């Protein structure tokens, strides 16, 4: 339930490797003055920013010709099962990254 | 000490998110 309980966005394009977002702030004050003051307070502002990164995953699988022919002739393909396992592995790895993280990859 | 770098710079693969965050100071 990693994707279900947390929002998903689509800002990043495939080719990017980093991203950045920024914030801002301000300071100031006021005082009671009289006529001919010649002395008044001042204000200013500031800002910051942060960054992030992107990763890649992958796996594979094998099959032969005799297995394909046997699967076609018995109504129980093996390629579909292997592909389903391959997709499930990616989903579970994404969940593991979300909920536990990896120390070497920071 | 020659330059044996790549072809692409660090700013060619970089995105700046549209949203910006501003702190709020309630009056009262």
């Amino acid at each position: 339930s990693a994707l279900r309980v947390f929002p998903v966005t689509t800002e990043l394009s495939p080719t990017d490797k980093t991203f950045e977002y920024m914030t801002f702030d301000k300071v100031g004050t006021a005082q009671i003055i009289a006529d001919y003051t010649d002395d008044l307070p001042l204000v200013d502002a500031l800002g910051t920013s942060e960054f992030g990164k992107v990763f890649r995953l992958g796996n594979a699988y094998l099959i032969s010709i005799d297995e394909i022919k046997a699967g076609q002739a018995t109504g129980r393909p093996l390629s579909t099962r292997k592909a389903s396992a391959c997709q499930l592995a990616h989903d579970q790895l994404v969940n593991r990254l979300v909920f536990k993280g990896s120390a070497p990859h920071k | 000490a020659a330059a044996t770098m790549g072809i692409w710079t660090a700013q060619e693969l970089h995105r700046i998110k549209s949203q910006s965050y501003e702190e709020d100071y309630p009056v009262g």
Binding site: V27, T29, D38, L40, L42, D44 | -
Partner: protein, 157 residues
């Protein structure tokens, strides 16, 4: 059902190295950072004053040197470094010779009003600093998050 709530928060008084008030102040240009980097809320020293051109070589305070001015916050001239506002080697600097400014502090006790200001070796205000300066306190004593700031009145050298 439920009770509505309303909150209230006050802004910070000031940031390091900013002009405190609108009183009579003088800011000197035509100053170039001879070596190293200068923090915004720190004093400077005059290495050399050119006799024909007019530029003044400025540098961060060291041991046994008289202070001359304090850098001023600007959103254009300055360069962001170490998550702070700084002046880099080369270029121009904005040092004020007379006026009031918020300065970086290391002391932990509030100072008096009409007392002389003492600076450390690195150009930051300190209660027991070795360097003695003709400038006097102004009474301002605040703290932005984890940065301590003090208001100091400067006089022309």
């Amino acid at each position: 059902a439920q009770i509505n709530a309303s909150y209230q928060r006050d802004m910070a008084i000031a940031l390091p190295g900013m002009v405190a008030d609108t009183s009579k102040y003088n800011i000197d240009g035509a100053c170039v950072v001879n070596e190293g980097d200068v923090l915004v809320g720190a004093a400077v020293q005059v290495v050399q004053a050119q006799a024909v051109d007019g530029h003044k070589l400025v540098k961060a305070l060291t041991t046994g040197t008289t202070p001359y001015g304090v850098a001023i916050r600007s959103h254009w001239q300055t360069v962001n470094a170490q998550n702070q506002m700084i002046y880099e080697d080369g270029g121009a600097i904005n040092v004020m010779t007379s006026g009031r400014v918020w300065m970086l502090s290391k002391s932990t006790e509030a100072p008096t009003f009409g007392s002389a200001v003492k600076l450390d070796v690195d150009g930051q205000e300190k209660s027991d600093g070795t360097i003695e300066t003709t400038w006097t306190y102004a009474g301002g004593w605040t703290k932005y998050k984890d940065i301590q700031l003090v208001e100091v009145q400067l006089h022309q050298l």
